[PDB]
């Protein structure tokens, strides 16, 4: 049984989730990683702007 409790059977290759709850979890984790990476990139851009300005 899917550890999210949707009533379907979980696949041990998918960490105990069924197919649908696994794909949701995969998409959400990538969305969060991609948003945090974008924030880091904007911080790096600001660091580039300061260094460039200082010369």
């Amino acid at each position: 049984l899917c550890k999210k409790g949707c009533g379907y059977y979980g696949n041990p290759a998918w960490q105990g989730f069924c197919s649908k709850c696994w794909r949701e979890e995969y998409h959400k984790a990538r969305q969060k990683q991609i948003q945090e990476d974008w924030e880091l990139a904007e911080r790096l851009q600001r660091e580039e702007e300061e260094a460039f300005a200082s010369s």
Binding site: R30, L40, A41, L44, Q45, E48, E49, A51
Partner: protein, 73 residues
């Protein structure tokens, strides 16, 4: 396998790579496609700037993973 490289302008670059590819070799592919010299490229994945002598597999970059790219001014 395909990966995506997103810039701060909203542009996404698709690259054909293998997990054993070095970061330096991915920067060469970006230069070939976008003209950006490797030395001006800063790659990001999962909270880390990517180091030239490491591989895509070292960072858990997988099929359809999205990296970010910032350029040195």
């Amino acid at each position: 396998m395909q990966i995506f490289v997103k810039t701060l302008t909203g542009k996404t670059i698709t690259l054909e790579v293998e997990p054993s590819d070095t970061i330096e070799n991915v920067k060469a592919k970006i230069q070939d496609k976008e003209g950006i010299p490797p030395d001006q490229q800063r790659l990001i994945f999962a909270g880390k700037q990517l180091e030239d002598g490491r591989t895509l597999s070292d960072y858990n970059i997988q099929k359809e993973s999205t990296l970010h790219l910032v350029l040195r001014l």
